[PDB]
Amino acid sequence: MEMEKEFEQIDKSGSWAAIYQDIRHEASDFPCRVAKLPKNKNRNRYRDVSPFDHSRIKLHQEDNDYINASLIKMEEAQRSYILTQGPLPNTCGHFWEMVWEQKSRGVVMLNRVMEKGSLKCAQYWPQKEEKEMIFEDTNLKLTLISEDIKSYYTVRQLELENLTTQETREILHFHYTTWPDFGVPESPASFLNFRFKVNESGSLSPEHGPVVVHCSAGIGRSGTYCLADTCLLLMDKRKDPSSVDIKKVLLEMRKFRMGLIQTADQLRFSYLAVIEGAKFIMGDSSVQDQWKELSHED
Numbered sequence: 001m002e003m004e005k006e007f008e009q010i011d012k013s014g015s016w017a018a019i020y021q022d023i024r025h026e027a028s029d030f031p032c033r034v035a036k037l038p039k040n041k042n043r044n045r046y047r048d049v050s051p052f053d054h055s056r057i058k059l060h061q062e063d064n065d066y067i068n069a070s071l072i073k074m075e076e077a078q079r080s081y082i083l084t085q086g087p088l089p090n091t092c093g094h095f096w097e098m099v100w101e102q103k104s105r106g107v108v109m110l111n112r113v114m115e116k117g118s119l120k121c122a123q124y125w126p127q128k129e130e131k132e133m134i135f136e137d138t139n140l141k142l143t144l145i146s147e148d149i150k151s152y153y154t155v156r157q158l159e160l161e162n163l164t165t166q167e168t169r170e171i172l173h174f175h176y177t178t179w180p181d182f183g184v185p186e187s188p189a190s191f192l193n194f195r196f197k198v199n200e201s202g203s204l205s206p207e208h209g210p211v212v213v214h215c216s217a218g219i220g221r222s223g224t225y226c227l228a229d230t231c232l233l234l235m236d237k238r239k240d241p242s243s244v245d246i247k248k249v250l251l252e253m254r255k256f257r258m259g260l261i262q263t264a265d266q267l268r269f270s271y272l273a274v275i276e277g278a279k280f281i282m283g284d285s286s287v288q289d290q291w292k293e294l295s296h297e298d
């Protein structure tokens, strides 16, 4: 693979920092003036992480339509994502309003609520079936229906109801719980096993809205997951691993949201995950059971 030969070169020359810095220097720079308006200051988790104006998700509210969230539209791969920060205590209603209005059926969460003693994300979903959450500002109700706890990730079945219309939808919550902030997953196997659970759920089928992916800021771990997912989808559509330029795909994604992938090692993990995932795409299905065993779900 042209991609695994390049990987060997970068490793042998120790160029991951240099390669990653090159991507930071070439990355798009678009205005974020809605995100920077004074009235939106308390809707942003990080002052240095904002959505571009041209690709931000607008809430269908006449009052204030701003949420820190971006629509990544990968034209060639024919897949879209919504990347967003971990909701704040005052934006959990906005978050589920976005999920409703964009018709998403899956939420991919790559962080924990508390990491390194800090609250990196609000508790925006219910932890107990009998303690549903009501978001008064956006008139939404959220109920935990069931959850499937594995050793390093949890899948939750949620019911989201629009209280104005009494319409309900099932939302699937894919929660990767062992991915450290500014770090990498334990192995390509762990990551690819989790990715398969997401893809196999149907959450990314095109009759639904785009899947929501978030970490704490919605750029680092979110960017790593989304880069690997898009690259694998591309080589799956083509059945040609050598036709995929990972760095070019990352630069394309960064046209829609800043800072996707936050460390050089996350970039390196992206290569490893795509290289390993190519095995399943090119016709070795047994590697999926290998990944499940290697991930130690139990």
Ligand SMILES: O=C(O)C(=O)Nc1sc2c(c1C(=O)O)CCNC2
Pocket (backbone or CB within 6 Å): 046, 048, 049, 111, 120, 181, 182, 215, 216, 217, 218, 219, 220, 221, 222, 262
């Ligand atoms: O959650 C992630 O994977 C991620 O990108 N996090 C990021 S990105 C980012 C910060 C954080 C953080 O969580 O502290 C702090 C301020 N600058 C950029």
Ligand SMILES: [Cl-]
Pocket (backbone or CB within 6 Å): 087, 088, 089, 119, 120, 121, 122, 123
């Ligand atoms: Cl928080």
